[PDB]
Structures are given as structure tokens and as C-alpha cells.
Amino acid sequence: IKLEKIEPPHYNHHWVRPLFLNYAYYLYEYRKNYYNDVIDYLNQREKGIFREPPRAQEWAERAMRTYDEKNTDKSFKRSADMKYIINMRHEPRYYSYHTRAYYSLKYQKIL
């Protein structure tokens, strides 16, 4: 059996330098999403309080929920975004003026 053809194998790095890198920064925050929300609802319901059964969730909505969980700064200035439409004024306006007293002990008699 002749006429063997080979391709360059491996190309393993000869000057060592393999290095390593941890990856828990993103995997944990994304893996945790599927299981926690369900289980965090399963056990919390087991605690004795009810809410909506687990709906199937789409990636963007799950990311939004994780973002809401992460932002510990539960900004009260969303209520500021609303008081852009609020801060109502002049509801207790008067436009009526005072009555004074045009009295000099007038007598209408009878009564």
C-alpha cells in the first residue's frame, strides 16, 4: 500500500505558554436564569404565597428580568419621569376674593 498523503497535524505550541482563564463572570449570570426563576418560584410558592405559574420566557424578557434583579438602585426617579407629567399645582385656587363687612348695624325691622 503506497501513495500516502498527510496533513500537518496538531501544530501544538512548542514554547509552552498555554495559559488559563476563568469564565464565571458571564456563564453564572446566564445559566442561573433558567433554573432560579422557576425554582425561586417553586420554593417561594412552597413557602405559602401564590403568584402566576411559570410562563415560557423569551431571551430578551429574561435578560430584562435579570437586569431588574441586578440594579440594586431601585431608582425612585422613574417616579420623577412620571412627575414630569405630575407636580400638579393650582388645584386649590380661589379666584373668589374676600367678603369684607358692609355692616353698620343696619335694621331691616320685622325680624
Residue numbers in the entry: 41 to 151
Study authors write:
Here, we report a thick filament structure from the indirect flight muscles of a third insect order, Hymenoptera, the Asian bumble bee Bombus ignitus. Flightin sequences vary in length but have a strictly conserved region in the middle, dubbed the WYR motif that spans over ~50 amino acids that are critical for normal flightin function. The C-terminus is embedded within the backbone based on evidence that deletion of the C-terminus results in filaments of irregular length, whereas deletion of the N-terminus produces filaments of normal length but in flies that cannot fly.
The non-myosin protein flightin reveals a newly resolved extension at the C-terminus that overlaps a previously unassigned density in both Drosophila and Lethocerus. For flightin, AlphaFold2 predicted a reasonable atomic model for the WYR domain corresponding to residues 56 to 102. The model of the two ends of the flightin density was rebuilt de novo using Coot. The density corresponding to the residues on the N-terminal side of the WYR motif of Bombus flightin, similar to that of Lethocerus and Drosophila, passes between the myosin tails of one curved layer to reach the outside of the backbone. The WYR motif itself is situated at the inside of the myosin tail annulus, where it contacts two curved myosin layers. The density on the C-terminal side of the WYR motif passes across a pair of myosin tails of one curved layer and ends up contacting yet another curved layer on the N-terminal side. Our more complete density of flightin resolves the identity of the so-called “blue” density first seen in Lethocerus thick filaments and later in Drosophila.
